[PDB]
Paper text:
Stimulator of interferon genes (STING) is a transmembrane protein located in the endoplasmic reticulum (ER). The activated cGAS converts GTP and ATP into 2ʹ, 3ʹ-cyclic guanosine monophosphate–adenosine monophosphate (cGAMP), which binds to STING, leading to its conformational changes and trafficking from the endoplasmic reticulum (ER) to the Golgi to perinuclear endosomes. Consequently, STING recruits tank-binding kinase 1 (TBK1), which phosphorylates IFN regulatory factor 3 (IRF3), leading to its translocation into the nucleus to drive the transcriptional induction of type I interferons and the nuclear factor-κB (NF-κB)-dependent expression of proinflammatory cytokines. Based on our molecular modeling analysis, along with the reported CDN-STING crystal structures, we designed a novel series of fused tricyclic heterocycle compounds and analyzed their binding to human STING with thermal shift assays and the potency in activation of STING signaling with a reporter cellular assay.
After exploring combinations of different monomers and various linkers, we identified compound SHR1032 with significantly improved binding to STING and cellular reporter assay (thermal shift ∆Tm = 10.7 °C; EC50 = 0.03 µM). We then obtained the crystal structure of SHR1032 complexed with human STING protein in C2 symmetry with 2 molecules per asymmetric unit that validated our predicted binding mode in the cGAMP binding pocket of STING. The structure revealed Fo-Fc difference density for a single SHR1032 that spanned between the two monomers resulting in a loss of higher C2221 symmetry. Further rational optimization based on the information from the cocrystal structures and structural activity relationship (SAR) led to the identification of SHR1032, which has greatly increased human STING agonistic activity compared to the CDN compounds. It exhibits selective and potent activity across all known major isoforms of the human STING protein.
Author numbering:
A (entry chain A), B (entry chain B): 153 to 228, 239 to 343
The structure:
Amino acid sequence: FNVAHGLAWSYYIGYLRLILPELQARIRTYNQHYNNLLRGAVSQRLYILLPLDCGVPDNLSMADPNIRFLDKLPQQVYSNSIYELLENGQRAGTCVLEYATPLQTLFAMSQYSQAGFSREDRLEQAKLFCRTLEDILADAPESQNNCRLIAYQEPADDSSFSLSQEVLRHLRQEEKEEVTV
Amino acid sequence: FNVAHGLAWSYYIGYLRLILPELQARIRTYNQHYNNLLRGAVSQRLYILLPLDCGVPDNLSMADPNIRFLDKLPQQVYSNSIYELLENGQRAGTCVLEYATPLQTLFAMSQYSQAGFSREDRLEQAKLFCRTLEDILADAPESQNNCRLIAYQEPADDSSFSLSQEVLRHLRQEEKEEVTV
Ligand SMILES: CCn1nc(C)cc1C(=O)Nc1nc2cc(C(N)=O)cc(OC)c2n1CCC[C@H]1COc2cc(C(N)=O)cc3nc(NC(=O)c4cc(C)nn4CC)n1c23
Ligand SMILES: [Ca+2]
Ligand SMILES: [Ca+2]
């Protein structure tokens, strides 16, 4: 009995498979403007946050102030937000960013006692969700190329973890890949 | 590996658990009007269609013409549709009616070859979805009393199946239950 299998399949079949095709077009279009205006550029892949603690806030900035809402992405109806990632108040990157909503479900199950679903269970299913979704996107056509999964475990407490730094690590790796190959 | 577990849990935690509480109230309010106008009454329970063939149309009437849209249910934002069930052109019942969307996912998985998910698999998982959702609602607090699951397998082919008759059987059984106990 693994809820993560179905959660992952539903998240792909009912959301990602449908939104990802439009995305590279929406982003190229926006980048025309963003470039001519702020000489910037938004990455072309959807960045999906997978906090293994299943903590999904209502606004990204609350999880890190160095992640700042920049703009809504226009459509070619799905709502997507571009964020700028800051370092010392200086813009270091930009990307379309959002949390994997199914993890909220996991969280809620852990707070729903009739479910008999512990925090241990919840973490286990979060990792399985990440794995299953990786596997799905691996066999998927151009969907894998259109997004990147950012899975992370935050420290038990009082340790220097920056979500913005994790995302920037991924963005910089993506650019390195793009220019070297 | 059973996607129905997660599909069922997500459909409960993320949709039903949230909408059902408002529903008894929304329906009572509407019934004030409906009564004073057409001397009719809408059942208080959400009726959830679970076709085991995972065929979900975009409008109920296409699956049966004796199921006729009547009105949108107002809010106390979620969109819910009241339907009248007809017999020989005469109204025989009314209720808030909608398909279980997760079945669409199953259908799509069966048409997505990378999934290795057959029609046999689709039917098995549809039955498991029905069972798991029944189990969940059974342990759930007054949520089970707010909705009713209408699961059905349509004929091999060319036999007498009427969706409106199935729904009316359930509605008539529900009224019998309310008046006798
Ligand atoms: C969670 C409940 N659930 N579990 C399963 C299984 C099926 C359902 C289900 O039926 N949900 C649902 N019923 C609604 C009814 C009404 C109404 N009658 O008024 C109104 C709704 O909108 C609130 C309803 N919603 C929300 C569906 C959101 C669904 C599409 O839109 C989205 C838009 C954007 C966006 N940036 O623009 C992001 C984004 N992220 C997700 N998440 C999933 O896609 C996902 C997760 C899992 C697991 N599977 N999926 C596929 C269903 N989405 C969306
Ligand atoms: Ca956290
Ligand atoms: Ca059918």
